[PDB]
Ligand binder design. Structure first.
Ligand SMILES: CCCCCC(=O)O
Ligand SMILES: [Fe+3]
Ligand SMILES: [Fe+3]
Length: 221
């Protein structure tokens, strides 16, 4: 059954999960702009992507206002700190393939999983907003997949390294959100399945074979 969106129990968990949505959209915006410093000829497309992320952020901000819940932004910022630190490191070293794997692949897949899972248990206001959002993040996966597919032969090793370092962070993120997510009536196994399916499909599209992908997914352990 649907959660009681008015309960103190729900609002408490929501303050953190919703803050994660909001912060995630903000960092996605920042990341796409940042990638523009690495792909100067991609700037106008990246600006469109980043603007979409700000629309997403505004929508989740609105979802919070609607339930009367103050977002715990401090919690969210710490939650994203490991991937954010790794993204910045890559950015400073000009490592475009690592930046794309972290943002366009890992974070977008995490988003699509969270949002797909949240929809059937969301309040009616948030549901319409979130239904809009999910259609968009496939556009973002497509963007990352396209560039990486086009450049695979020069960046294969970097990508294996990027996955090795960053996929475990996604696993720890899922472990950390699981409790609050369950209060929101979201099953951890659904979140994991949806995430892994999205990621595997991106890797397939990029040109990795089944063995390579199996070895990659394994690094989560
Ligand atoms: C769960 C928050 C992640 C959203 C990141 C994005 O919109 O690309
Ligand atoms: Fe988004
Ligand atoms: Fe996105």
């Amino acid at each position: 059954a649907l959660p009681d969106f008015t309960s103190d129990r729900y609002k408490d968990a929501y303050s953190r999960i919703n803050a994660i949505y909001i912060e995630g959209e903000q960092e996605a915006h920042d990341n796409y702009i940042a990638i523009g410093t690495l792909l100067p000829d991609h700037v106008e497309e990246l600006k469109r992507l980043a603007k979409m992320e700000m629309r997403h952020k505004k929508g989740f901000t609105a979802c919070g206002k609607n339930l009367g819940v103050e977002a715990d932004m401090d919690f969210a910022r710490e939650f994203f700190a490991p991937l954010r630190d790794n993204f910045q490191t890559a950015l400073g070293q000009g490592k475009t393939p690592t930046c794309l794997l972290i943002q366009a692949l890992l974070i977008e897949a995490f988003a699509i999983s969270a949002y797909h899972t949240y929809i059937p248990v969301s309040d009616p206001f948030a549901r319409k907003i979130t239904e809009g959002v999910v259609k968009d993040e496939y556009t973002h996966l497509n963007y990352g997949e396209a560039w990486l597919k086009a450049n695979l032969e020069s960046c294969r090793e970097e990508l294996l390294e990027a996955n090795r370092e960053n996929l475990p962070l996604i696993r720890r993120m899922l472990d950390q959100v699981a409790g609050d997510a369950a209060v929101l009536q979201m099953d951890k196994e659904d979140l994991i399945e949806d995430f892994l399916i999205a990621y595997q499909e991106s890797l397939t599209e990029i040109g990795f074979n089944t063995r390579e992908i199996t070895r990659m997914a394994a690094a989560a352990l």
